[PDB]
Design a protein around this ligand. Structure first.
Ligand code: HBI
Ligand code: HBI
Lengths: 346, 354
């Protein structure tokens, strides 16, 4: 019995714009994870979204603000011509053409709508607790529909008082499309949305360690920013994952310095690129200290320097071995089936 | 054929508190207007609500911010522990116990949720255009579910582009609570919140000049304002006659020769003109918004030029031309529960499926 799934993406931005964060990696990988087992998976996402191979349906409208831009007492916002609202209205309309509906939005409304749907609606939470309304909505969903919530990390699960009631699936990626290369060259990678404050700001600043360039990937937003330390910093634009990975794989190490998934680490490993992260949040469950990467104290600009000088120690083939050992699609396949299948009956 | 209805109140505040606004009068009245015609009506409302003779279930939560205090580009807010969201969740729980659910809340969420219900949801919009997100929600609802949206006035409909596709049910009240009084005292009425920038100094000035003392009705939050009113006018000029209730209002109001109605906002539908007619009171109102379709000019009242003393003074000196018996007959004819019942049935019975 092959089942039919509908994935409703994040409303902060179009899939494959770079603006939807880590959902743009996880959504297609978890989709591919089920299609490989003979399931049908169809995606619904904001207008402007791109997705190879997969039945996609898009809807135009106003993007949802970022959640890490609002307090804890701040309410859920539904602006005019909300894309989120129209995404869900749309899912509701076709609910009977599907066996289950998985939501990837870190948003109140999808959770709230769960009992209003006849088709079972499972939810994959992507961030820690940020809002009171959001935690209350996840909790209400659990209470009525147990097992229907999931998470990637336990450090994510632990920010919730209902934390132990959420499943863990962790995170995967399509290993086949990442080429592991030994050829390293003194470069250094960094991969994300190049925001006003993501880790430049203040992680390039620790690229001085051996005056190393820091080749920067990521979708460039429309506004400007720019020059401190006079311009040894090799740049890149957005580009597909396959162009990313060739350009990335040939780094000596990848840096991560977010404020606190973050399933970028996991891409670097798939190329045998050792990760230097802050010993904080997600990275701790991905990186194995002084083996696949370094996990240093946050906010030093000194610890990182040292970490970057110790890269040659780490076996690059080991990084690639971990990535395969844990983070395959085939394993994430089973874990999704041991999450969703039971909800088709309960 | 009788049916079962579920009425879901406003999330701005409890019923029986003053915070729910005109829903505090509309909801019971429309409810009563169906029960006195065979139907059953239940009510869902926020924690604290007081509502007699009618099955009431109350719901805990944060109240919803009044829509008029937000601008047009502002989003819809759903706060943590929202009474609004919990109301509509509870309604959906019991949806199969009723033939139709009628929403009284001026908010995005109940409108968005209409296709998500198997039981028909009808919406009584209570204010004029305020937001982009609310206007589009009603618009969407109109398209998919024509005949689903009702309004109190054409003046309020006129604020929306799609106003022509809304139904005007007007308004009603329980006439038996209001005593017709054909012989009033030499006094004038004014009803509403006692604060600055609310129309009262206009009504005091025009009353005094006319040679009649004014009697007032409503909430006084700032005593310094009241003493300041006495300072610059007269101790005789204006007289507190209590808060509003409804039985105290119809007692005290019927005794006046006229209601001076001098509001600022571009409506004030505003129940009070209807209630004044119920006691056989002629209304002297500003010629704008709701009263333009309430008062028949020169027969049940006078519609006058806004913010102008001479215009009130002239209307006051023509109150005696107006038959108080007529004021009552138009309240009986246009604003009765009996009359609202057919309109509600004209509107809601076609919306029933099965
Ligand atoms: C990966 C993560 O889900 C993504 O970066 C974000 N998603 C969301 C967000 N904010 C909201 N309101 N909703 C989301 O789904 N901010 C960031
Ligand atoms: C009758 C009048 O419309 C009522 O007092 C109000 N209701 C509401 C309001 N604001 C919102 N958001 N919702 C309501 O139902 N402001 C005033």
């Amino acid at each position: 019995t092959a089942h039919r799934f509908l994935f409703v993406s994040t409303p902060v931005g179009p899939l494959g714009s770079g603006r939807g964060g880590g959902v743009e990696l996880t959504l297609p990988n978890l989709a591919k994870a089920l299609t490989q087992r003979g399931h049908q998976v169809s995606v619904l996402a904001p207008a402007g979204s791109v997705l190879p191979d997969l039945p996609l349906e898009t809807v135009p409208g106003t993007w949802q603000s970022t959640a890490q831009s609002h307090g804890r007492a701040t309410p859920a916002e539904i602006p005019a011509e909300s894309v989120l609202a129209r995404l869900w209205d749309r899912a509701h309309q076709q609910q009977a053409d599907f066996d289950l509906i998985l939501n990837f939005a870190y948003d109140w409304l999808p959770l709230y709508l769960t009992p209003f749907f006849k088709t079972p609606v499972a939810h994959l939470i992507s961030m820690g607790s940020l809002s009171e309304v959001m935690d209350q909505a996840i909790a209400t969903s659990l209470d009525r529909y147990p097992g229907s919530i999931a998470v990637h990390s336990l450090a994510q699960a632990a920010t919730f008082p209902f934390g132990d009631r959420c499943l863990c699936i962790g995170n995967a990626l399509d290993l086949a499309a990442y080429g592991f290369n030994p050829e390293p060259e003194p470069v250094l990678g960094w991969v994300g949305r190049i925001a006003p404050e993501k880790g430049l700001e203040d992680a390039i600043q620790a690229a001085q360690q051996a005056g190393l360039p820091l080749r920067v990937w990521g979708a460039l937003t429309e506004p400007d920013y720019w020059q401190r330390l006079q311009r040894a910093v090799s740049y890149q634009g957005f580009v597909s994952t396959d162009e990313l990975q060739r350009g990335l794989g040939r780094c000596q190490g990848l840096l991560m310095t977010p404020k606190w998934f973050g399933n970028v680490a996991i891409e670097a490993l798939a190329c045998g690129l050792p990760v230097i992260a802050y010993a904080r949040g997600g990275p701790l469950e991905i990186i194995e200290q002084g083996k696949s990467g370094w996990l240093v104290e946050p906010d030093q600009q000194a610890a990182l320097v040292n970490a970057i000088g110790q890269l040659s120690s780490l076996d690059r083939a080991y990084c690639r071995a971990q990535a395969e050992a844990r983070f395959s699609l085939a394993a994430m396949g089973q874990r999704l089936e041991a999450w969703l299948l039971p909800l088709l009956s309960r």
